[PDB]
Design an enzyme around this catalytic site. Structure first.
Site, PDB file in Angstrom:
ATOM      1  N   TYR A   1       0.276 -50.946  -9.989  1.00 46.43           N
ATOM      2  CA  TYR A   1       1.708 -50.906  -9.584  1.00 46.43           C
ATOM      3  C   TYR A   1       1.865 -51.709  -8.294  1.00 46.43           C
ATOM      4  CZ  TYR A   1       3.134 -47.654 -13.283  1.00 46.43           C
ATOM      5  OH  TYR A   1       3.403 -47.142 -14.526  1.00 46.43           O
TER       6      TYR A   1
ATOM      7  N   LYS B   1     -10.949 -46.359 -17.134  1.00 45.64           N
ATOM      8  CA  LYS B   1     -11.307 -47.321 -18.198  1.00 45.64           C
ATOM      9  C   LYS B   1     -12.413 -48.243 -17.661  1.00 45.64           C
ATOM     10  CE  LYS B   1     -10.520 -48.850 -22.374  1.00 45.64           C
ATOM     11  NZ  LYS B   1     -10.421 -48.050 -23.627  1.00 45.64           N
TER      12      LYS B   1
ATOM     13  N   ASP C   1      -8.248 -43.533 -23.135  1.00 41.57           N
ATOM     14  CA  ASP C   1      -7.818 -43.461 -24.563  1.00 41.57           C
ATOM     15  C   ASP C   1      -8.287 -42.132 -25.181  1.00 41.57           C
ATOM     16  OD1 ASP C   1     -10.200 -45.058 -24.012  1.00 41.57           O
ATOM     17  OD2 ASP C   1     -10.353 -45.471 -26.137  1.00 41.57           O
TER      18      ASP C   1
ATOM     19  N   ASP D   1       0.673 -42.247 -14.635  1.00 39.42           N
ATOM     20  CA  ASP D   1       2.058 -42.416 -15.127  1.00 39.42           C
ATOM     21  C   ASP D   1       2.145 -42.093 -16.620  1.00 39.42           C
ATOM     22  OD1 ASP D   1       4.819 -43.127 -14.430  1.00 39.42           O
ATOM     23  OD2 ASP D   1       4.444 -44.700 -15.968  1.00 39.42           O
TER      24      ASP D   1
HETATM   25  N1  LIG Z   1     -14.648 -50.581 -31.281  1.00 39.45           N
HETATM   26  C1  LIG Z   1     -15.617 -49.859 -30.728  1.00 39.45           C
HETATM   27  O1  LIG Z   1     -16.728 -50.071 -31.126  1.00 39.45           O
HETATM   28  C2  LIG Z   1     -15.406 -48.829 -29.619  1.00 39.45           C
HETATM   29  C3  LIG Z   1     -14.210 -48.130 -29.428  1.00 39.45           C
HETATM   30  C4  LIG Z   1     -14.095 -47.186 -28.393  1.00 39.45           C
HETATM   31  C5  LIG Z   1     -15.163 -46.950 -27.568  1.00 39.45           C
HETATM   32  N2  LIG Z   1     -16.305 -47.640 -27.751  1.00 39.45           N
HETATM   33  C6  LIG Z   1     -17.440 -47.364 -26.842  1.00 39.45           C
HETATM   34  O2  LIG Z   1     -17.950 -46.098 -27.235  1.00 39.45           O
HETATM   35  C7  LIG Z   1     -18.576 -45.411 -26.149  1.00 39.45           C
HETATM   36  C8  LIG Z   1     -18.103 -43.963 -26.118  1.00 39.45           C
HETATM   37  O3  LIG Z   1     -16.708 -43.855 -25.793  1.00 39.45           O
HETATM   38  P1  LIG Z   1     -15.875 -42.470 -25.811  1.00 39.45           P
HETATM   39  O4  LIG Z   1     -16.870 -41.394 -25.566  1.00 39.45           O
HETATM   40  O5  LIG Z   1     -14.814 -42.550 -24.725  1.00 39.45           O
HETATM   41  O6  LIG Z   1     -14.982 -42.398 -27.149  1.00 39.45           O
HETATM   42  P2  LIG Z   1     -15.508 -41.945 -28.577  1.00 39.45           P
HETATM   43  O7  LIG Z   1     -14.455 -42.459 -29.502  1.00 39.45           O
HETATM   44  O8  LIG Z   1     -16.867 -42.556 -28.759  1.00 39.45           O
HETATM   45  O9  LIG Z   1     -15.653 -40.358 -28.504  1.00 39.45           O
HETATM   46  C9  LIG Z   1     -14.494 -39.550 -28.342  1.00 39.45           C
HETATM   47  C10 LIG Z   1     -14.704 -38.130 -28.847  1.00 39.45           C
HETATM   48  O10 LIG Z   1     -14.361 -38.115 -30.241  1.00 39.45           O
HETATM   49  C11 LIG Z   1     -15.469 -37.634 -30.994  1.00 39.45           C
HETATM   50  N3  LIG Z   1     -15.535 -38.515 -32.133  1.00 39.45           N
HETATM   51  C12 LIG Z   1     -15.431 -39.853 -32.030  1.00 39.45           C
HETATM   52  N4  LIG Z   1     -15.547 -40.390 -33.259  1.00 39.45           N
HETATM   53  C13 LIG Z   1     -15.720 -39.368 -34.127  1.00 39.45           C
HETATM   54  C14 LIG Z   1     -15.952 -39.314 -35.486  1.00 39.45           C
HETATM   55  N5  LIG Z   1     -15.954 -40.389 -36.264  1.00 39.45           N
HETATM   56  N6  LIG Z   1     -16.095 -38.129 -36.064  1.00 39.45           N
HETATM   57  C15 LIG Z   1     -16.094 -37.008 -35.340  1.00 39.45           C
HETATM   58  N7  LIG Z   1     -15.902 -36.995 -34.018  1.00 39.45           N
HETATM   59  C16 LIG Z   1     -15.711 -38.170 -33.408  1.00 39.45           C
HETATM   60  C17 LIG Z   1     -16.716 -37.794 -30.140  1.00 39.45           C
HETATM   61  O11 LIG Z   1     -17.787 -36.860 -30.450  1.00 39.45           O
HETATM   62  C18 LIG Z   1     -16.134 -37.669 -28.731  1.00 39.45           C
HETATM   63  O12 LIG Z   1     -16.126 -36.334 -28.321  1.00 39.45           O
HETATM   64  C19 LIG Z   1     -18.222 -46.227 -24.929  1.00 39.45           C
HETATM   65  O13 LIG Z   1     -19.390 -46.922 -24.569  1.00 39.45           O
HETATM   66  C20 LIG Z   1     -17.162 -47.221 -25.352  1.00 39.45           C
HETATM   67  O14 LIG Z   1     -17.275 -48.464 -24.675  1.00 39.45           O
HETATM   68  C21 LIG Z   1     -16.433 -48.563 -28.732  1.00 39.45           C
END
Ligand SMILES: NC(=O)c1ccc[n+]([C@@H]2O[C@H](COP(=O)([O-])OP(=O)(O)OC[C@H]3O[C@@H](n4cnc5c(N)ncnc54)[C@H](O)[C@@H]3O)[C@@H](O)[C@H]2O)c1
Ligand SMILES: NC(=O)c1ccc[n+]([C@@H]2O[C@H](COP(=O)([O-])OP(=O)(O)OC[C@H]3O[C@@H](n4cnc5c(N)ncnc54)[C@H](O)[C@@H]3O)[C@@H](O)[C@H]2O)c1
Lengths: 338, 333
Positions: free
Chosen positions: A128, A177, A210, A234
């Protein structure tokens, strides 16, 4: 024996600002809190009335009283002047934006009664910043910047832990983030881990923004104190307002060392401006925060109980709560339970 | 036809196992060409994004990808972002659709598509710096007329191709006048060329409040990179969680199909992960390569497995496991 009169700056604002502030001052007069109001202008109304968005009289009034109660101010989307909300937060160094979200009875929220959290939003830096915003001459490329400081991050996370300790809550979650925005959000998170070290009895959790928004809409009950940077706080505090029945029930206190400005989380709501539909409860809950801040906890509790009891009785509720009432009707319904 | 498969990190391997099991049972006629990206490629050949992986995707133009880990703070910058920039996959398409028996706090009327700008905005490596003394950090965002125009066009073309009636452009052009402002002015100009589609603008914080109060009002949401990241994770929560949220990285000349979720290191390797997100990503892939009939069979089978409560993962309240859940879905193909 009389109570001390305390003068507060009152900013009536734009859109729904004037009607909800008339309603709010009505309820605070009924409270008999011993408050005198000194009216100042800021934003749109200040510009047209004094030729200045943030007049010297408004700065002097807030500097003298150290407490303002403020209605929303419009800031124009795109081409136009820069936010006077941000400008006042920067000018008075109100670095802690404190936003409680707490389940209320008989609202249109899709969530049961388990929500009880506080967002502590960093209020002076982050994304901001008016400076560093540029568009190339040919209109093809825009840039904007963010700035996070060790000092800014330290004082916001220390605020969040001190709040945890003063309020008896058990968990601070730092929302970031830092996987993608490694410099700014990264510095915030490293400072948050350093500060957590000094409050060993308080659980410290880290979480990516996120994931936090997904967790908030599935199990908002897990959250206690959320501490985060300016833009993320925010978005998160507006989402949490949705969890507890909407913008009509969400206050946000801008706290600094020497000054404090109490307001609603919501904006000027131009779509309903001046039609007497606006819910005044967000601003009244901000006035309750103000009463706690200026040393009247019994009156703050009385205003909160009046509000809860009014929603519980479904008495003259505004349309946003599924009622057919109006702003001043809702205010009188609350005033009558004091 | 051949697709590049990236098995990835954390839960990536288990869910890709389950997904490919179901694609075989569907008989999509796909051959799997395996490639590494991120930690696995780094460990093996000392390169996060090997030339063999880039050549696999350049050749096949279609990848199915599991989550890749990105370190939080100091360490490499995202290989997800790197592939999106390298292949210019500017349109990240994330449909959020209510399913049955789905443990969501919400009604059964959520049906929207987040169209997230996928190459610029605030997800920029360049411009990130910390002062010598460690006191001040800066970061930057870049938005262009070209990038804004192509993503808003994608949103309006998607509305026409899908029969959908409203596009909402989400911004913070009140505070961030340069970058979010330029995106919003380009969105208004593009809306002009699709006069039968309703155009709405909405500030991002209001949008998140609206999503948790009446998500039914939304049709297509179009926004910038970071906002679209936050909003699509909120919408996944609206429809039962990250177990049920696909995300397609679409560009002109290539496409990478994945789950919205990450590598989920808190449950990695335990067979708890929900494979539905990646499987809905594979259905987006089947639609993309011209197998709409098979895409619809896969979606119907997933819906019918949820309706039956057959072998659901614990995130949907079941005690079934990743492969079990995939087998249950395969059984109804
Ligand atoms: N496109 C991608 O590959 C992508 C997207 C988001 C995050 N990441 C990376 O993943 C790592 C972990 O990030 P995070 O912990 O904030 O988010 P996450 O999406 O990995 O986990 C969020 C929560 O949701 C649960 N969860 C996620 N996917 C699930 C599934 N398919 N089934 C059941 N439960 C599920 C997990 O156990 C966790 O508690 C970070 O290193 C990040 O950079 C990669
Ligand atoms: N601190 C502040 O002063 C502040 C905060 C947010 C927005 N704003 C400004 O407000 C203007 C409009 O912003 P916006 O439209 O995105 O958000 P908004 O907060 O003004 O309103 C969003 C939605 O919530 C409703 N709403 C808000 N408060 C309500 C209330 N008390 N009762 C019933 N309904 C209510 C509105 O009618 C609207 O549909 C912008 O120019 C923005 O800069 C100011």
């Amino acid at each position: 024996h009389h109570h001390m009169t305390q003068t507060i700056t009152v900013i009536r604002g734009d859109g729904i600002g004037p009607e909800i502030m008339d309603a709010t001052l009505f309820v605070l007069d009924a409270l008999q809190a011993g408050l005198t109001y000194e009216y100042a202008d800021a934003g749109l109304v200040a510009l047209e009335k004094h030729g200045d968005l943030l007049p010297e009289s408004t700065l002097a009034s807030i500097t003298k009283n150290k407490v303002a109660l403020k209605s929303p101010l419009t800031t124009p989307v795109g081409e136009g002047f820069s936010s006077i909300n941000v400008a006042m937060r920067r000018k008075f160094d109100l670095y802690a934006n404190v936003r409680p979200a707490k389940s209320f009875p008989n609202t249109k929220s899709r969530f049961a009664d388990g929500v009880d959290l506080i967002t502590v939003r960093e209020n002076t830096e982050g994304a901001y910043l008016s400076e560093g915003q540029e568009v190339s001459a040919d209109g093809e490329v825009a840039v904007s910047g963010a700035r996070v400081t060790r000092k800014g991050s330290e004082r916001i996370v220390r605020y969040a832990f001190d709040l945890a300790r003063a309020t008896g809550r058990k968990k601070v979650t730092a929302v970031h983030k830092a996987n993608i925005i490694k410099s700014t959000s990264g510095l915030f998170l490293k400072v948050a881990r350093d500060v957590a070290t000094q409050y060993p009895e308080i659980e410290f959790q880290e979480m990516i923004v996120d994931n936090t928004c997904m967790q908030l809409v599935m199990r908002p009950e897990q959250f206690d104190i959320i501490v985060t940077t300016n833009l993320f706080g925010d978005i998160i505090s507006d989402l949490c307002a949705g969890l507890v029945g909407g913008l009509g029930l969400a206050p946000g206190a801008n706290i600094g060392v020497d000054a404090a400005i109490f307001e609603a989380v919501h904006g000027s709501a131009p779509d309903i401006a001046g039609q007497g539909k606006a819910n005044p409860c967000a601003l009244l809950l901000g006035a309750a925060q103000m009463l706690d801040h200026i040393g009247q906890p019994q009156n703050a509790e009385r205003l909160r109980e009046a509000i809860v009891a009014t929603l519980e009785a479904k008495d003259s509720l505004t349309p946003d709560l599924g009622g057919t009432g109006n702003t001043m009707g809702f205010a009188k319904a609350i005033a009558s339970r004091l």
